[PDB]
RNA sequence: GAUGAUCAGGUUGAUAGGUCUGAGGUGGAAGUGUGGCGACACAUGGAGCUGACAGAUACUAAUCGAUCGAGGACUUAAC
RNA sequence: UAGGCCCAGGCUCUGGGCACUGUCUCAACGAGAGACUCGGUGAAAUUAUAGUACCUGUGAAGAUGCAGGUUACCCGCGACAGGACGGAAAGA
RNA sequence: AUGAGUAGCGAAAGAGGGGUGAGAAUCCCCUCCACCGAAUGCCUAAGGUUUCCUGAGGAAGGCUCGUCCGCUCAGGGUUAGU
RNA sequence: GACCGAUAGUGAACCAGUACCGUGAGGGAAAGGUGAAAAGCACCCCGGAAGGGGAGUGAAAGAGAUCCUGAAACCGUGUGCC
RNA sequence: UUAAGUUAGAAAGGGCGCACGGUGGAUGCCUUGGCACUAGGAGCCGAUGAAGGACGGGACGAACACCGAUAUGCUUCGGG
């Protein structure tokens, strides 16, 4: 089994689940599919996340890019980025630029 | 107007029960093997 | 009916004149999905127009068509483009000039994109 | 019809656009010719133009596809 | 773009008449912005915990949470403004 | 943490072709269109204090994006007897 | 020193009367810890980068730069029973 | 086969327990800094320009510290 994780990913976590979601459990060939056509913000990286866990597969354990499936896929809270004064347009006050930790696992089925 | 009361976990778990993504319809292109929308176009594919 | 396509009145009849012109020049134009949608009827009936060839059609056509330059090599207006070179094209064509192909969502705003070309 | 939903269709097909022919609306187009010093008038000529309405017509788009979806528990009684 | 008129008295006030109108009998349609759906970003007041129905009683102020009964498959989205022990208020 | 992926994200006109680029609605060029014009034009004060030019940049910041910026970093740039 | 040990002890263990606030007199913070030694990750791979997976150093890399230990709220993934 | 009866299971999601993480910096060890005193010194500097500052000085940025156009130092006498 092979893993790629993406630290302080300036994404909500929240918004990211939503994707992770969809791709978990599915075939690796398809779910980058399933990447590609969602047309959500959080695609882009989960798929950059779930390519680098297939290149690691082959290039350093050698197990075949085919016969591989998404064994786990979840999203974890960072950092968060305080800004007290939006004041600049907007009239809020500390508001808060979230962050992600993204990992995707991969094995053999 | 006010919240007169924090919301439990149990309720916004429940609430956000809807809230969620459909698996997109995707068809596998004639020639080539990429996949793309139905009714797309991919002659690239 | 028709869509309003989030403009006003004459902005609208602004950006479909404009889309016409530029579907004339270029044969081949990418936009908006209902954008293609509203465009395909009016560019359809200038071709029918272009088709007669007379003059009462000539000015009918030029009092919507842009004043644009379609090749610089000959010296071409858009209008002449249209009564002379598509207008000779489709000259066994009983309407369809046009075919709208969906491409999909755009970054910026998720629109959904369109590829509508003269057939 | 807020969105879901509902309803009519998906190439042995008229679902929508276009085209053709119509219905209704406005009302006598451009060019040319004539009369007038001119603004204009007359003829060609119920003419030209026409969004959401009707009938024909596969000309354009509904392609290819994918997913889900049974194998029918036990007891008693009458057969 | 840019004043409604007329006949009066009292020096501006009270008038009267006319004109005119969606002020209303009584509302209908249309345009735009928001609402609504999709993509991006993303706060605040408030907050004992909470799986928080209704009626009739009981009760230190007015019962969701006490007693007796009657109703009710699980989870949402959009509206209403009834309760809102919401805030305004104010009498006093 | 909750409210909640909720309210906001204000006028006001843009559309297409090409380019650059890992990536373009938003940056550059072209074309047409549109708005101001006793100004939304020209100059020059008070005030600010490098914000000016060239190259590089994609942490942070810029109510979205960003290859862009009044942002960041390196070099430069202000000449009086009137 | 039967004094404190980073919310304590000076306001100040750190470029502190600093940063900030105010016209001014004046008011006045937050912020300590890699490892014995940088030996602080050559090289390969995915990626524009950030960030990872190997390889290597090291007693330890889950000691990799807000880098000793690391609790609770809060946020997630899997699963036994309902 | 018909009729009349019984039960089971079902998870869009949720609850409890368990396993594993993230965030965040309590806790424990540690000390560069303080606090209260004791025993001695010393109790003033300045027009021969003070206390306190501004501006400058390095081969190459800013800052602290040191120094003053003799400017990251000069002379001498000692130590090492």
């Given at each position: 089994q092979a893993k790629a994780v993406a630290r302080?990913?300036?994404?909500?976590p929240r918004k990211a689940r939503l994707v992770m979601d969809l791709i978990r459990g599915k075939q690796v060939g398809e779910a980058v599919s399933i990447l590609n056509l969602?047309?959500?913000?959080a695609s882009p990286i989960i798929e950059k996340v779930l390519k680098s866990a297939i290149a690691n597969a082959e290039?350093?354990?050698?197990?075949?890019?085919?016969?591989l499936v998404i064994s786990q896929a979840f999203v974890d809270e960072g950092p968060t980025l305080k800004?007290?004064?939006?004041?600049?347009?907007?009239?809020?006050?500390?508001?808060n630029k979230r962050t992600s930790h993204i990992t995707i696992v991969v094995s053999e089925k | 107007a006010v919240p007169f009361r924090r919301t439990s976990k149990m309720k916004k778990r429940l609430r956000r029960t809807h809230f969620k993504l459909n698996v997109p319809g995707m068809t596998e292109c004639p020639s080539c093997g990429e996949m793309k929308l139905s009714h797309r176009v991919c002659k690239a594919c | 009916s028709y869509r309003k396509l989030g403009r006003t009145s004459a902005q609208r009849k602004a950006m479909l004149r404009d889309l016409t012109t530029d579907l004339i020049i270029n044969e081949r134009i990418e936009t908006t999905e209902t954008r293609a949608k509203e465009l395909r009827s009016v560019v359809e009936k200038m071709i029918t127009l272009g088709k007669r060839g007379d003059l009462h059609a000539r000015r009918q056509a030029a009092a919507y068509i842009?004043?644009?330059?379609?090749?610089?090599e000959n010296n071409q207006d858009a209008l002449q483009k249209l009564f002379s070179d598509i207008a000779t094209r489709y000259?066994?064509?009983?309407?369809?000039?046009t075919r709208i192909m969906k491409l999909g969502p755009r970054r910026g705003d998720g629109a959904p994109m369109a590829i509508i070309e003269l057939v």
């Open positions: 302080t990913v300036r994404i909500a969602t047309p959500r913000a290039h350093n354990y050698e197990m075949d890019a085919n016969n800004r007290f004064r939006p004041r600049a347009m907007g009239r809020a006050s500390q508001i | - | 842009r004043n644009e330059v379609a090749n610089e000259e066994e064509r009983q309407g369809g000039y």
